Amino acid sequence: MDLPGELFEASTPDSPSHLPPDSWATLLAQWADRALRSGHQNLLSEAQPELERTLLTTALRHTQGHKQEAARLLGWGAATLTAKLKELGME
Amino acid sequence: MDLPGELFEASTPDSPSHLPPDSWATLLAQWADRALRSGHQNLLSEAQPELERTLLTTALRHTQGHKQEAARLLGWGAATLTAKLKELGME
């Protein structure tokens, strides 16, 4: 018998998230190499939007909702912030 | 007295390099934020060339010296591989 019950269900609360040291570059150096020895294709096209999304969302956080303010935040403008959004989706 | 001598000099050999888990994204999320609360400016312009240099050099390694082959390696061409080289230096 045990005091605590055998709780076995995934609920919303009681679920902390862990943030380990993500070795992105280490994953990109080994990934780009593993794909090169098999069938590489969208190499830079995959991490390209990854770096843009991270920063874009971060700076935007300073102005959540104000996607325009994010422009001056990254030395960009309103055409780049918008054109760069489809550039990764088009290229 | 000790068998080994007190070797205290930096030489070429006898110098192994360590490669810990670099948390780039973690450094970019905290850096972009720390700079935003002070004087942000070249936010994306700093990590932009960092992601391009890493992949560019990696794929090029498959064709060391053949900077041209790196083109098809990243679904790029000869104009992009060259134009993208100055794009980060110009923007």
From Swiss-Prot, chains A, B:
Name the record gives this protein: DNA-binding transcriptional regulator NtrC
Modification after translation: Phosphorylated and dephosphorylated by NtrB.
Function according to Swiss-Prot or TrEMBL: Member of the two-component regulatory system NtrB/NtrC, which controls expression of the nitrogen-regulated (ntr) genes in response to nitrogen limitation. Phosphorylated NtrC binds directly to DNA and stimulates the formation of open promoter-sigma54-RNA polymerase complexes.
Domain of life of the native organism: Bacteria
Gene name of the record: glnG
Subcellular location: Cytoplasm
Location of the DNA-binding region in this protein: 67-86
Organism: Salmonella typhimurium (strain LT2 / SGSC1412 / ATCC 700720)
Parent-record interval covered: 379 to 469 of 469
